Structure formats: structure tokens, C-alpha cells
């Protein structure tokens, strides 16, 4: 159902860096400056629940981790302006590079979680072949950071976020996604 691909639950992580949580305006850094920003996001989330779940169930991911990207690349839109990030490269709640992929429907919808958790699927399968001898959940985190830096970013467990923005890609967002997945998600 939404377990295929790991459990966010069972993964590790160190949360935010100091360079995600400052910024944020918080005065203390890891799991649980993490889960003030995804308290902070929630009530905006919220406005998109329904279709985030209904995308985790279809293609077989946790919605808390699709929650947790939005809450990471995009505040859950706040950040955004019709949907362009703030270089005019990403799109939507969840930030298709227009570098990358040609961006596919409106920047809130259905079409767009789609793209966007699948092109987070490749990537989790990519680490899986990568990375045979790891645990599922493990190959979750490695997926999650290759979504910002690309899977030839990932070449081991312990220091897979370091490259990624903020070297603390999927640190921070497994840790949000832990916090959503207590909230419904
Ligand atoms: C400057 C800033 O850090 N910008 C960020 C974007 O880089 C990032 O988008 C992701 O970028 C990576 C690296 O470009 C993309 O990787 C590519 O992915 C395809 C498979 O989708 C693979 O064929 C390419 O070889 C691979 N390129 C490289 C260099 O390895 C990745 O697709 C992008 N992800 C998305 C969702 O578009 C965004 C999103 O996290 O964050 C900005 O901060």
C-alpha cells in the first residue's frame, strides 16, 4: 500500500543542519528544529492531504515522505510564486528542476505529486542497485538524497547528505516526514 519502497520510521537520522534551521529563524539545529518547521507547515499542508495521500497510496510511498519533500522544497507553496520557485528553475510544491524534466500540470495538483514522486521512485530504485546489500529503509534515505543531488551524489550511507543542499537533504526530511507521519499522514 505505501510501504513498498520503506519505512520512515526505521530510519536514522541527525535532522535538520544548523544552515536549514537558522534561516528558518530557530535557535537549535537537528530532529527536532526538523519537526518545529514541519509544525509550521501543517496547517498549509493540510489544504493538500488528500491528494498527497491519494499519490503515496498509488504509487506505493509513504505520503509523510512526499509531505516531507513539500515541506523541504517548498514550504507547502508559501514559498513559491505561481508556483516558480524563487529562481525560476523549480516548479510546484514539490520542485521539478525544469533543467531536468519538463514540468507536467499545475503547480498544486495531482499531476505534479505525481511527477515528482516518481521521479523520487527512480530514484529510490537506483540506490537499490546501487546498494544491494542495504536495508530497505535504508535505500529510502539514499533515494531521498539523491533527489536533490543525484544518485551519483549517494556513494555511501553515512555521508550521502553531504553534497546535497545544506548537506542535510534527507536527514531533514526523513525527520519532517516523521513528525507528519504522526499527523495522518
Ligand atoms: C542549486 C540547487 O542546488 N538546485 C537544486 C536542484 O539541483 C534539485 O533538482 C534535482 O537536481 C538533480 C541534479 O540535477 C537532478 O539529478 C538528475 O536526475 C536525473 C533523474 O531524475 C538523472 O538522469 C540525472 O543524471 C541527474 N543529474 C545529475 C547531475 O546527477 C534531479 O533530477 C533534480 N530533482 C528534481 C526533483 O528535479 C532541486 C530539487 O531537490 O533542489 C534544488 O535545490
Same mark, same amino acid.
Given at each position: ?7 520512515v520510521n526505521?530510519i536514522?537520522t541527525?535532522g535538520a ?13 537537528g530532529v527536532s528544529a526538523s519537526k518545529k518547521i514541519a509544525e509550521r507547515d501543517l496547517?498549509?499542508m ?8 491519494? !499519490? ?6 509513504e505520503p509523510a515522505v512526499?509531505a516531507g519533500?513539500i515541506s523541504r @522544497?517548498?514550504?507547502?507553496?508559501? !514559498? ?15 520542485? !521539478? ?12 495538483? @495531482? ?42 551524489? !549517494? ?17 531533514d526530511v526523513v525527520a519532517r516526514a516523521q513528525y507528519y507521519k504522526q499527523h495522518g499522514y
Open positions: 500500500r505505501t510501504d513498498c519502497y520503506g519505512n526505521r536514522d541527525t543542519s544548523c544552515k536549514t534551521a537558522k534561516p528558518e529563524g530557530l535557535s537549535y539545529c496547517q498549509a493540510d489544504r493538500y492531504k488528500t491528494i498527497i495521500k491519494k !499519490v503515496g497510496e498509488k504509487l506505493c510511498v512526499i519533500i @522544497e517548498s514550504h507547502a507553496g508559501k !514559498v513559491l510564486k505561481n508556483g516558480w520557485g524563487d529562481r525560476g528553475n523549480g516548479f510546484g510544491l514539490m520542485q !521539478v528542476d525544469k533543467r531536468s524534466h519538463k514540468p507536467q500540470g499545475t503547480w498544486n495538483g @495531482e499531476v505534479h505529486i505525481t511527477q515528482g514522486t516518481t521521479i523520487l521512485i527512480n530514484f529510490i530504485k537506483t540506490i537499490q542497485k546501487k546498494f544491494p546489500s542495504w536495508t530497505k529503509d535504508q535505500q529510502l534515505k539514499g533515494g531521498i538524497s539523491a533527489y536533490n543531488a543525484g544518485a551519483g551524489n !549517494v556513494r555511501s550511507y553515512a555521508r550521502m547528505d553531504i553534497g546535497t543542499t545544506h548537506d542535510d537533504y534527507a536527514n
